[PDB]
Design a protein around this ligand. Structure first.
Ligand SMILES: Nc1nc2c(ncn2[C@@H]2O[C@H](COP(=O)(O)OP(=O)(O)OP(=O)(O)O)[C@@H](O)[C@H]2O)c(=O)[nH]1
Ligand SMILES: Nc1nc2c(ncn2[C@@H]2O[C@H](COP(=O)(O)OP(=O)(O)OP(=O)(O)O)[C@@H](O)[C@H]2O)c(=O)[nH]1
Ligand SMILES: [Mg+2]
Ligand SMILES: [Mg+2]
Lengths: 411, 409
């Protein structure tokens, strides 16, 4: 099987450097070097992220998309920066109109994209990893998938938060994520800072970091499950256990051992310590706080030798101490997953992929903000004036809003 | 006469290397002797490689060591239909290539019940067998257990494997599910029982089946013998495996336990590699395979005492259902694992009314999932239909009635 990473924007890019910084070592691939792999198993499945050309040069099969040179020119001028084949670096009026990047402006640039998304797929393809309330985002990216899904999965690692029409560009994209995408690990820039400045006494959290933290979660998700386990799952399981209603629904990823370097290295990681972590408010890469709305599904994708008993068990008390918020029409919201090998240097970790709520309590939010401002067409002229439609916004909000109703169908 | 074996999954392979070890060990065939009679499958090279790098390296043919190159998927459908299909041919080929070289009796499969490549795949493997050879499909699994399942879907994968297994899987030795752990907690003491420790066990009980039995003795028991003395009815009936001297090689020392103790310690409700406690299940046939220093009178007495304990109630239509299998060579414990190492053991297996449970509890799971179609779209879109499910459910239904009628009455 295979996948092709996608470093959209600076952030998504900055993180690329960290996602690949890691992953490589978790696959013994030095800058341009080959497989120094301490073992022999970190190679039989690499393909998922590289390509064979020379014989020591397995090049990451990702894409680096960005309209700001300096960025990619910082990622390409630093450490592992010289492993990406230059071909990878893909450096109109990008109006902040969902309809401007989905129907009028983006619709053109699409074919010249699909072109490549095929050059990379035909590099069997599984899906693409994507790291990164606007035009080029909700509209054009929400199109990229609607096309992809007609032609493999689409995991999205978003750094959820800053705009005015926001609910317009949003409601319209969530809509598409219902019949297109189907896997988002909603990470974030200020939910990260927090989680990175108080859960990691880290005082100067550079972007590289945030990115790095995020990339840490998207590794636990995918790649991870493509490892053995007493009880392993894979994108689908994750999908087929987490989406009660077709909207596509968005999640909120959370990593396990998130302790400051020296001191904190408490090792309180028997397991109750990981669920302690993962399930608290802070520590949810999302902005919103779980404590503010039930869950529909949860997927503790652990990856480190543990007792299918102390795992399967804990999950329960957790489900009972908080019966309040965990929705009821799902006897067992939680989807326990269990890999074996842990994050290279750690003893025990567990990625958390939480699905927000059925009284969709986030898409609700978003959807609300829209209407309250759509009603007055607030900053709508910046969309329409960019070749959009008054029916486009209607569409999204309606399509995205419906997701909340369906998701409740299971709560 | 023979019984091929397909060890699937890293685990099924680790357990395989183990069960395969115990074998030669009690047949005097060192590292490099004859030729096995099984195969090894895995989609992760590094593990089968362990059989290619480590011990028992040259006792295999790089031909009976396969890997793969696709996705597992913890979903029946995909494993049975869609993906699993592609491999089957090839799979069969070996159980037709290995079945020829030997009039065989079946394939002892080593992997697990509920799962992606364990439920689905086999479903059609046993499926394609019942038509070809009509033979036996006894799959030796390391699974659950009810309240401690793993996969989120598990039941979907079980209810589907049962229905399509009715004519596919004859008997699934459902050990390691969670009842073998008890044995590791209660009869050996250890909270850290790695999957490797659980296999060493079946790796033992199994050694008592083939290995030693196909090995000369004072009361030999052929494979056919089993099914004959062990299945009262065509349903690929599933007996349960049990071992006697499961004492710890460090804790206690109650080793010297006369045959008049090891036998009885196979009746208790906490030493049978199966969470099917005789909650009522009347035995209907037991094959007491002994090994080591055992006097036939000791047995033809230790068993007599049992036949009259009544609280051990055997089926009605069955006067005597005790196949006494005596071997010579005592067991052979891992040099330094955690198994005691006695000079006699009792690997008694049997059809109790009792899987009446295990099947029940596994069937109900399907109804819960299917009742909502859960992961159904995953199979349909893989060349299956509302038929195969619903019609494989009805299948097992008459396996809940079968295992009920042949007993309790
Ligand atoms: N972790 C991380 N987050 C970043 C980084 N750069 C930006 N962000 C976050 O991503 C969002 C910023 O997106 P922008 O840089 O404004 O825009 P863009 O997505 O690159 O595309 P344009 O709006 O067209 O410029 C904010 O929420 C930032 O906090 C980065 O290097 N790392
Ligand atoms: N008893 C026993 N269980 C094992 C052994 N090795 C692995 N297992 C168990 O079997 C499962 C592991 O399967 P993997 O090793 O990940 O995979 P595989 O089935 O060999 O095939 P791939 O996923 O393609 O590598 C886990 O539930 C382990 O606990 C073993 O030697 N003995
Ligand atoms: Mg930009
Ligand atoms: Mg393997």
């Amino acid at each position: 099987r295979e996948i092709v990473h996608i470093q959209a924007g600076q952030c998504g890019n900055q993180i690329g450097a960290k996602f690949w910084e890691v992953i490589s070592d978790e696959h013994g691939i030095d800058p341009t070097g080959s497989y120094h792999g301490d073992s022999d198993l970190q190679l039989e499945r690499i393909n998922v992220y590289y390509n064979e050309a020379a014989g020591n040069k397995y090049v990451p099969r990702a894409i680096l998309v960005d309209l700001e040179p300096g960025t990619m020119d910082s990622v390409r001028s630093g450490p592992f920066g010289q492993i990406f084949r230059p071909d990878n670096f893909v450096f109109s009026g990008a109006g902040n109109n969902w309809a401007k990047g989905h129907y009028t402006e983006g619709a053109e640039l699409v074919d010249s994209v699909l072109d490549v998304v095929r050059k990379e797929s035909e590099s069997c393809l599984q899906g693409f990893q994507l790291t990164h309330g606007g035009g080029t985002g909700s509209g054009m990216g929400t199109l990229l998938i609607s096309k992809i899904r007609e032609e493999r999965i689409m995991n999205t690692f978003s750094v959820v938060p800053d705009t005015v029409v926001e609910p317009y560009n949003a409601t319209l994209s969530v809509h598409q994520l219902v019949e297109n995408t189907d896997e988002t690990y909603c990470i974030d820039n200020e939910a990260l800072y927090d989680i990175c400045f108080r859960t990691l006494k880290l005082t100067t959290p550079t972007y590289g970091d945030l990115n790095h933290l995020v990339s840490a979660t998207m590794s636990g998700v995918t790649t991870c499950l493509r490892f053995p386990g007493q009880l392993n799952a894979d994108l689908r399981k994750l999908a087929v256990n987490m989406v009660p209603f077709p909207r596509l629904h968005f999640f909120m990823p959370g990593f396990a051992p998130l302790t400051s370097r020296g001191s904190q290295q408490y090792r309180a990681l028997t397991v109750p310590e990981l669920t302690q972590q993962m399930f608290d408010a802070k520590n949810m890469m999302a902005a919103c706080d779980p404590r503010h709305g039930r869950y529909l599904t949860v997927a503790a994708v652990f990856r480190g030798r543990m007792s299918m008993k102390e795992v399967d068990e804990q999950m329960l008390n957790v489900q009972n101490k908080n019966s309040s918020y965990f929705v009821e029409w799902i006897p067992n919201n939680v989807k326990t997953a269990v890999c074996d090998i842990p994050p290279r240097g750690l003893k025990m970790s567990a990625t958390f992929i939480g699905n927000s709520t059925a009284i969709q309590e986030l898409f609700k939010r978003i959807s609300e903000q829209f209407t309250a401002m759509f009603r007055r067409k607030a900053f709508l002229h910046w969309y329409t004036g960019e070749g959009m439609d008054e029916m486009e916004f209607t569409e999204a909000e309606s399509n995205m809003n419906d997701l909340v109703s369906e998701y409740q169908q299971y709560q | 006469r023979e019984c091929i074996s397909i060890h699937v999954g890293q685990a099924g392979v680790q357990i395989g290397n183990a069960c395969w070890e115990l074998y030669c060990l009690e047949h005097g065939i060192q590292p490099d002797g004859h030729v096995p009679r099984a195969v090894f499958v895995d989609l992760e090279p590094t593990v089968i490689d362990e059989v290619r790098t480590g011990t028992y390296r040259q006792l295999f043919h790089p031909e009976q060591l396969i890997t793969g190159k696709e996705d597992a998927a913890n979903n029946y459908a995909r494993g049975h239909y869609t993906i699993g299909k592609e491999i089957i041919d090839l799979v069969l080929d070996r159980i037709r290539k290995l079945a020829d070289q030997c009039g065989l009796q079946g394939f002892s499969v080593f992997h697990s019940f509920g799962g992606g490549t364990g439920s689905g795949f086999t479903s059609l493997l046993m499926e394609r067998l019942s038509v070809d050879y009509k033979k036996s499909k006894l799959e030796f699994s390391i699974y659950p257990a009810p309240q401690v399942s793993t996969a989120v879907v598990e039941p979907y994968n079980s209810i589907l494997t049962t229905h399509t297994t009715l004519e596919h899987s004859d008997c699934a030795f459902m050990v390691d599910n969670e009842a073998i752990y008890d044995i590791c907690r209660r009869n050996l003491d250890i909270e850290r029982p790695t999957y490797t420790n659980l296999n060493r066990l079946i790796g033992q009980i199994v050694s008592s089946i083939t290995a030693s039995l196909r090995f000369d003795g004072a009361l030999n028991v052929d494979l056919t013998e089993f099914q004959t003395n062990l299945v009262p009815y065509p349903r690929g009936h599933f007996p349960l495996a049990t071992y006697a001297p499961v004492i710890s090689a460090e804790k206690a020392y109650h080793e010297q336990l006369s045959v008049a103790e090891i036998t009885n310690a196979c009746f208790e409700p906490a030493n049978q590699m199966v969470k099917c406690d005789p909650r009522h299940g009347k035995y209907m046939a037991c094959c007491l395979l002994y090994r080591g220093d055992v006097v036939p009178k000791d047995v033809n007495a230790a068993i007599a005492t049992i036949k009259t304990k009544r609280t051990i109630q055997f089926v009605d239509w069955c006067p005597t259902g005790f196949k006494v299998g005596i071997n010579y060579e005592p067991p052979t414990v891992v040099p330094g694992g955690d198994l005691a190492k006695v000079q006699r053991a009792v690997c008694m297996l049997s059809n109790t009314t009792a899987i009446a449970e295990a099947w029940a509890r596994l069937d109900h799971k399907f109804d819960l999932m299917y009742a909502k179609r859960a992961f159904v779209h995953w199979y349909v879109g893989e060349g299956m239909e509302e038929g195969e499910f619903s019609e494989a459910r009805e299948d097992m239904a008459a396996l809940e009635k079968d295992y009920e009628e042949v007993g309790v009455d």
